[PDB]
Design an enzyme around this catalytic site. Structure first.
Site, PDB file in Angstrom:
ATOM      1  N   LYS A  21       0.801  -1.211   0.000  1.00 51.82           N
ATOM      2  CA  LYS A  21       0.000   0.000   0.000  1.00 51.82           C
ATOM      3  C   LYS A  21       0.850   1.285   0.000  1.00 51.82           C
ATOM      4  CE  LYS A  21      -4.142   2.079   1.870  1.00 51.82           C
ATOM      5  NZ  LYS A  21      -3.612   3.410   1.439  1.00 51.82           N
ATOM      6  N   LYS A  34      -6.630  -7.215  -2.104  1.00 52.03           N
ATOM      7  CA  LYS A  34      -6.425  -8.314  -3.051  1.00 52.03           C
ATOM      8  C   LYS A  34      -5.072  -8.994  -2.853  1.00 52.03           C
ATOM      9  CE  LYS A  34      -9.763  -6.994  -6.551  1.00 52.03           C
ATOM     10  NZ  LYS A  34     -10.552  -6.070  -5.707  1.00 52.03           N
ATOM     11  N   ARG A  82       5.234 -14.825 -30.464  1.00 47.88           N
ATOM     12  CA  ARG A  82       6.240 -13.783 -30.408  1.00 47.88           C
ATOM     13  C   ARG A  82       7.288 -14.036 -31.482  1.00 47.88           C
ATOM     14  NH1 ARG A  82       5.695 -10.506 -26.451  1.00 47.88           N
ATOM     15  NH2 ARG A  82       7.859  -9.764 -26.457  1.00 47.88           N
ATOM     16  N   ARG A 137      14.574  -1.833 -27.311  1.00 43.94           N
ATOM     17  CA  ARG A 137      14.789  -1.998 -25.866  1.00 43.94           C
ATOM     18  C   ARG A 137      15.599  -3.239 -25.504  1.00 43.94           C
ATOM     19  NH1 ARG A 137       9.153  -1.269 -25.564  1.00 43.94           N
ATOM     20  NH2 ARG A 137       9.045  -3.252 -24.425  1.00 43.94           N
ATOM     21  N   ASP A 177       8.188  -2.617 -35.235  1.00 40.74           N
ATOM     22  CA  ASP A 177       7.842  -1.209 -35.331  1.00 40.74           C
ATOM     23  C   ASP A 177       8.988  -0.452 -35.982  1.00 40.74           C
ATOM     24  OD1 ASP A 177       5.358  -1.524 -33.502  1.00 40.74           O
ATOM     25  OD2 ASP A 177       7.016  -2.276 -32.266  1.00 40.74           O
TER      26      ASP A 177
HETATM   27 MG    MG Z   1       3.496  -2.420 -32.924  1.00 32.32          MG
HETATM   28 MG    MG Z   2       6.247  -3.854 -30.845  1.00 33.14          MG
HETATM   29 NA    NA Z   3      -0.437   3.933  -2.310  1.00 30.70          NA
END
Ligand code: MG
Ligand code: MG
Ligand code: NA
Ligand code: CL
Ligand code: CL
Ligand code: CL
Ligand code: CL
Ligand code: CL
Ligand code: MG
Ligand code: NA
Length: 326
Positions: A51, A63, A140, A174, A183
Site C-alpha cells: 500500500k 487483493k 512472439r 529496448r 515497429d
Molecule cells: Mg506495434
Molecule cells: Mg512492438
Molecule cells: Na499507495
DNA sequence: GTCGG
DNA sequence: GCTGATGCGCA
DNA sequence: CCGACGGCGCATCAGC
C-alpha cells in the site's frame, strides 16, 4: 520472477476491466500498480507493505492480502468460471476486435474461433485479417527473426531513396530476446515540421515492400502511419514463418528524437514519462515537448538534440532503452 | 481504482 | 463534405 | 469525496 504472482493477478484483472467491464481507468490503475510492484526490489509480504507504493490503494492491498494468504483470488476464480466473460475476453485477442465488438459478437451468439469463421460476413477487413492470422499473431518473434526482418526493411528502403532513415523501435530497440511485432520509425529530409515537398513518402516505402512480397496485407494506412502484416521468406520444404504484425510511422525529420522516444516505449514507461512531464510543467507527444501555459494550453516546441534532452527538461536521469522495459 | 484538488 | 465522437489501435 | 487520469493515427458513423 520476484512478485510475479501478484503482477500476474493484477494484469489479469486489468484485462478483465478493459475487455469485459469496459472500465478503462481501472485498467490503467491495475497496470500502474503491476508496473510499480514489478520494479519494487523486495518480496511483498503484506498488503500494508504494498500500500505504501504509489498506485496501490486500499482495494489492491486487500487483493494482495488474499492472494498472499491463499495463493488465489476468489474474484478471478469467478471471472474464469463465467463463460460469457471468457468469450468476450478471448475475442478481444483478435486484431480489429476490441471490447465493444467482442460484446456485440458474444451477445449475438458468436463465442468461439469456429463461430467467427462461420460468420466472416460480419467481420470488417481488419477483423478478417486478424482472424486469418490469429494463431500467427499470438506468437512472439525471436530476436533472430527480427534481425532478418530489419535487414529486409532497411535494404528495401535504401533502394527507394538512400536519404530515408529507418529505425526499428519498440521492444526490439529496448533489447528484448523476443518481440510481439515490428515497429519501424521512418524519416526523410523532405518531410519536416516546416513542410512536405514530396508526396507519398510512406506510400513509396509500403509499395516497395509489397512489390518484394515482404508486406502481405494492409490493416490501415494514412499519410504518416501504416499498420499491416509481413512475412519472412522461407526455404524449400521448410515450414513457413508465421505472418507478423508490422507498424511503420513516418515522423518529421526534425522531430526524430520525440518520435524515437515515443516509439521505443514501453507503453507504460511512456505514460509515466508523460505524466511526470505534466507534473513538471510540460507536455510530450511523438512530435514535440512543449511548456504548459497557465491557460492550460501548450507553448511552442522546445529545442531537442537527443533523447537525453527530453529526459533533462523533466529532470529525469537518462534511461537507456534496455531500462525502459517493464 | 487511486489520488489529489 | 464538415466537426465531433466513437472504436480500435500504437508506444 | 468527487472527478481527472499520455497522447494521437486511422476508419467510421452521427448529425449536420
Ligand atoms: Mg506495434
Ligand atoms: Mg512492438
Ligand atoms: Na499507495
Ligand atoms: Cl473505469
Ligand atoms: Cl487466482
Ligand atoms: Cl496498401
Ligand atoms: Cl525531436
Ligand atoms: Cl505537436
Ligand atoms: Mg503494444
Ligand atoms: Na483485438
Amino acid at each position: 520472477t520476484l512478485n510475479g504472482g501478484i503482477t500476474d493477478m493484477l494484469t489479469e484483472l486489468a484485462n478483465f476491466e478493459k475487455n469485459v467491464s469496459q472500465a478503462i481507468h481501472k485498467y490503467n490503475a491495475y497496470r500502474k500498480a503491476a508496473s510499480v510492484i514489478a520494479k519494487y526490489p523486495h518480496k511483498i509480504k503484506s498488503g500494508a507493505e504494498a500500500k505504501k507504493l504509489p498506485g496501490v490503494g486500499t482495494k489492491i492491498a486487500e487483493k494482495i492480502d488474499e492472494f498472499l494468504a491463499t495463493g488465489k483470488l476468489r474474484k478471478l476464480e469467478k471471472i474464469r468460471q463465467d463463460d460469457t466473460s471468457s468469450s468476450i475476453n478471448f475475442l478481444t485477442r483478435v486484431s480489429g476486435i476490441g471490447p465493444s465488438a467482442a460484446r456485440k459478437f458474444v451477445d449475438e451468439g458468436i463465442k468461439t474461433l469456429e463461430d467467427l469463421r462461420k460468420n466472416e460476413d460480419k467481420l470488417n477487413h481488419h477483423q478478417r485479417i486478424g482472424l486469418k492470422y490469429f494463431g500467427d499473431f499470438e506468437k512472439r518473434i525471436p530476436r533472430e527473426e527480427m534481425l532478418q526482418m530489419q535487414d529486409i526493411v532497411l535494404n528495401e528502403v535504401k533502394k527507394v531513396d538512400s536519404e530515408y532513415i529507418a529505425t526499428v523501435c519498440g521492444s526490439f530497440r529496448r533489447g528484448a530476446e523476443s518481440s510481439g511485432d515490428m515497429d519501424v520509425l521512418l524519416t526523410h529530409p523532405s518531410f519536416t515540421s516546416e513542410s512536405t515537398k514530396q508526396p507519398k513518402l510512406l506510400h513509396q516505402v509500403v509499395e516497395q515492400l509489397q512489390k518484394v512480397h515482404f508486406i502481405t496485407d494492409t490493416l490501415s494506412k494514412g499519410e504518416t502511419k501504416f499498420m499491416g502484416v509481413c512475412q519472412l521468406p522461407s526455404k524449400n520444404d521448410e515450414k513457413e514463418y508465421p505472418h507478423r504484425r508490422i507498424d511503420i510511422r513516418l515522423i518529421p525529420k526534425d522531430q526524430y528524437y520525440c518520435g524515437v522516444l515515443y516509439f521505443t516505449g514501453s507503453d507504460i514507461f511512456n505514460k509515466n514519462m508523460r505524466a511526470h512531464a505534466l507534473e513538471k510543467g510540460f507536455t510530450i507527444n511523438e512530435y514535440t515537448i512543449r511548456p504548459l501555459g497557465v491557460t492550460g494550453v501548450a507553448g511552442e516546441p522546445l529545442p531537442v538534440d537527443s533523447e537525453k534532452d527530453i529526459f533533462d527538461y523533466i529532470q529525469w536521469k537518462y534511461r537507456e532503452p534496455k531500462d525502459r522495459s517493464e
